[PDB]
Design an enzyme around this catalytic site. Structure first.
Site, mmCIF file in Angstrom:
data_model
loop_
_atom_site.group_PDB
_atom_site.id
_atom_site.type_symbol
_atom_site.label_atom_id
_atom_site.label_comp_id
_atom_site.label_asym_id
_atom_site.label_seq_id
_atom_site.Cartn_x
_atom_site.Cartn_y
_atom_site.Cartn_z
ATOM 1 N N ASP B 25 0.812 -1.072 -0.049
ATOM 2 C CA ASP B 25 -0.069 0.131 0.276
ATOM 3 C C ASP B 25 0.943 1.422 0.010
ATOM 4 O OD1 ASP B 25 -1.872 1.875 0.536
ATOM 5 O OD2 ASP B 25 -2.864 0.799 2.469
ATOM 6 N N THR B 26 1.057 1.770 -1.118
ATOM 7 C CA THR B 26 1.965 3.014 -1.393
ATOM 8 C C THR B 26 1.300 4.089 -0.578
ATOM 9 O OG1 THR B 26 1.318 3.556 -3.343
ATOM 10 C CG2 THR B 26 3.162 2.206 -3.285
ATOM 11 N N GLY B 27 0.034 4.072 -0.339
ATOM 12 C CA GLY B 27 -0.527 5.237 0.429
ATOM 13 C C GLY B 27 -0.662 5.081 1.634
HETATM 14 C C1 LIG Z 1 -8.700 6.798 0.048
HETATM 15 C C2 LIG Z 1 -9.547 5.795 -0.249
HETATM 16 C C3 LIG Z 1 -9.999 5.618 -1.731
HETATM 17 C C4 LIG Z 1 -10.968 6.012 0.542
HETATM 18 N N1 LIG Z 1 -9.295 4.508 0.147
HETATM 19 C C5 LIG Z 1 -8.835 4.102 1.386
HETATM 20 O O1 LIG Z 1 -8.447 4.857 2.430
HETATM 21 C C6 LIG Z 1 -8.248 2.398 1.334
HETATM 22 C C7 LIG Z 1 -9.017 1.644 2.397
HETATM 23 C C8 LIG Z 1 -8.686 0.206 2.269
HETATM 24 C C9 LIG Z 1 -9.595 -0.399 3.470
HETATM 25 C C10 LIG Z 1 -9.068 -0.053 4.870
HETATM 26 C C11 LIG Z 1 -7.751 -0.351 5.190
HETATM 27 C C12 LIG Z 1 -6.937 0.701 4.197
HETATM 28 C C13 LIG Z 1 -7.382 -0.045 2.731
HETATM 29 C C14 LIG Z 1 -6.299 0.791 1.854
HETATM 30 N N2 LIG Z 1 -6.789 2.361 1.710
HETATM 31 C C15 LIG Z 1 -5.933 3.202 1.051
HETATM 32 C C16 LIG Z 1 -4.708 3.558 1.855
HETATM 33 O O2 LIG Z 1 -3.605 3.777 1.253
HETATM 34 C C17 LIG Z 1 -4.863 4.967 2.759
HETATM 35 C C18 LIG Z 1 -5.022 6.127 1.892
HETATM 36 C C19 LIG Z 1 -5.062 7.347 2.778
HETATM 37 C C20 LIG Z 1 -3.990 8.035 3.119
HETATM 38 C C21 LIG Z 1 -3.847 9.268 3.823
HETATM 39 C C22 LIG Z 1 -5.202 9.618 4.233
HETATM 40 C C23 LIG Z 1 -6.377 9.046 4.058
HETATM 41 C C24 LIG Z 1 -6.398 7.773 3.275
HETATM 42 N N3 LIG Z 1 -3.922 5.000 3.760
HETATM 43 C C25 LIG Z 1 -4.248 4.778 5.134
HETATM 44 O O3 LIG Z 1 -5.486 4.873 5.559
HETATM 45 C C26 LIG Z 1 -3.056 5.366 5.943
HETATM 46 C C27 LIG Z 1 -2.999 4.384 7.053
HETATM 47 C C28 LIG Z 1 -1.823 4.457 7.884
HETATM 48 N N4 LIG Z 1 -1.685 5.533 9.085
HETATM 49 O O4 LIG Z 1 -0.702 4.173 7.901
HETATM 50 N N5 LIG Z 1 -3.024 6.668 6.562
HETATM 51 C C29 LIG Z 1 -1.806 7.490 5.975
HETATM 52 O O5 LIG Z 1 -0.716 6.959 5.695
HETATM 53 C C30 LIG Z 1 -2.012 8.906 6.472
HETATM 54 C C31 LIG Z 1 -1.200 9.788 6.003
HETATM 55 C C32 LIG Z 1 -1.221 11.273 6.638
HETATM 56 C C33 LIG Z 1 -2.474 11.622 7.077
HETATM 57 C C34 LIG Z 1 -2.718 12.697 7.369
HETATM 58 C C35 LIG Z 1 -3.934 13.144 7.553
HETATM 59 C C36 LIG Z 1 -4.848 12.074 8.207
HETATM 60 C C37 LIG Z 1 -4.747 10.709 8.112
HETATM 61 C C38 LIG Z 1 -3.559 10.683 7.300
HETATM 62 N N6 LIG Z 1 -3.243 9.131 7.144
#
Ligand SMILES: CC(C)(C)NC(=O)[C@@H]1C[C@@H]2CCCC[C@@H]2CN1C[C@@H](O)[C@H](Cc1ccccc1)NC(=O)[C@H](CC(N)=O)NC(=O)c1ccc2ccccc2n1
Ligand SMILES: CC(C)(C)NC(=O)[C@@H]1C[C@@H]2CCCC[C@@H]2CN1C[C@@H](O)[C@H](Cc1ccccc1)NC(=O)[C@H](CC(N)=O)NC(=O)c1ccc2ccccc2n1
Ligand SMILES: [Cl-]
Ligand SMILES: [Cl-]
Lengths: 99, 99
Positions: B25-27
Site C-alpha cells: 500500500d504505497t498510500g
Molecule cells: C482513500 C480511499 C480511496 C478512500 N481508500 C482507502 O482509504 C483505502 C481503504 C482500504 C480499506 C481499509 C484499510 C486500508 C485500505 C487501503 N486504503 C488506502 C490507503 O492507502 C490509505 C489512503 C489514505 C492516505 C492518507 C489519508 C487517508 C487515506 N492509507 C491510510 O489509511 C494510511 C493508514 C496509515 N496510517 O498508515 N494513512 C496514512 O498513511 C496517513 C498519512 C497522513 C495523514 C494525514 C491526515 C490524516 C490521515 C493521514 N493518514
C-alpha cells in the site's frame, strides 16, 4: 519514472481543467478528490477505509491527465483529507510495483 | 517481481512466527495487521485514515519476511479492515512504483 517510497508518492494531475496533486496509492481501489467541480451527473457512493466511511459523489468516464497521460475513468469527490489516485486509474497508465 | 495492479497487490508475509497476507500500500505510512499475535509489551499509538483515527498497538523491532527479504521494522496491530504493508516496510525491501 521510477519512484522510491521514502516520501509519499504524490503526482501532478489535471482534472476538470485544474492542476491538482494526488497520492499514487496501490492500496486503493478508487480515485478520489476533495473540492473539484466536475460537470454532468453524479451518483451517491459510500467508500470505506481506516476510521470509517466517506459519503461521496461518483462521476463516471471523467478524463484525468496523469502527469502526462490521458485516462478516462471513475472519479469520486468528497471530504477526504487527501486526493488519491487508486488502482482503477493507475492500471490505465501501466503502473507497476517492483522489488 | 514486477507487479501489475489489476488485482489488489496482496503478498505473503511472515510476521513474527506467522504466515499472513497483506496489501502492498504505497498510500500508507505504516504497516498494520489485525490478524497476528505478537509477544510482550507494546506502546499505544494513533493512526489516521480516510474516516478518522484508530487506536493501535505499536510493537517495535519485529521481523518481517516478504519476498525473501528479511527486514526488522515497526508493526502496528489495530482494527484495520485489511492488513497493510506501508512505505516504512516497502522502502526496506527496495520497492519502487514505476510507470
Ligand atoms: C482513500 C480511499 C480511496 C478512500 N481508500 C482507502 O482509504 C483505502 C481503504 C482500504 C480499506 C481499509 C484499510 C486500508 C485500505 C487501503 N486504503 C488506502 C490507503 O492507502 C490509505 C489512503 C489514505 C492516505 C492518507 C489519508 C487517508 C487515506 N492509507 C491510510 O489509511 C494510511 C493508514 C496509515 N496510517 O498508515 N494513512 C496514512 O498513511 C496517513 C498519512 C497522513 C495523514 C494525514 C491526515 C490524516 C490521515 C493521514 N493518514
Ligand atoms: C475491506 C472493505 C473495504 C471493508 N471491504 C469489505 O470487507 C467488503 C465489503 C462488502 C460489502 C459488505 C459485505 C461484504 C462485502 C465484501 N467485503 C470483502 C471482504 O469481506 C473479503 C474478506 C476475505 C478475504 C479473503 C478471503 C475471504 C474473505 N475481502 C475480499 O474478498 C477481497 C480480498 C482480495 N484479495 O481481493 N478484498 C476486497 O473485497 C476488498 C474490497 C475493497 C478494498 C479496497 C481497498 C483495499 C482492499 C480492498 N479489498
Ligand atoms: Cl491539490
Ligand atoms: Cl479504496
Amino acid at each position: 519514472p521510477q519512484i522510491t517510497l521514502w516520501k509519499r508518492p504524490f503526482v501532478t494531475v489535471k482534472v476538470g481543467g485544474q492542476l491538482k496533486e494526488a497520492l499514487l496509492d496501490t492500496g486503493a481501489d478508487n480515485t478520489i478528490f476533495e473540492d473539484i467541480n466536475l460537470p454532468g451527473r453524479w451518483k451517491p457512493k459510500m467508500v470505506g477505509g481506516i476510521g470509517g466511511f466517506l459519503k461521496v459523489r461518483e462521476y463516471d468516464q471523467v478524463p484525468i491527465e496523469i502527469a502526462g497521460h490521458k485516462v478516462i475513468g471513475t472519479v469520486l469527490v468528497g471530504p477526504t483529507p487527501v486526493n488519491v489516485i487508486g488502482r482503477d486509474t493507475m492500471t490505465q497508465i501501466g503502473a507497476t510495483l517492483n522489488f
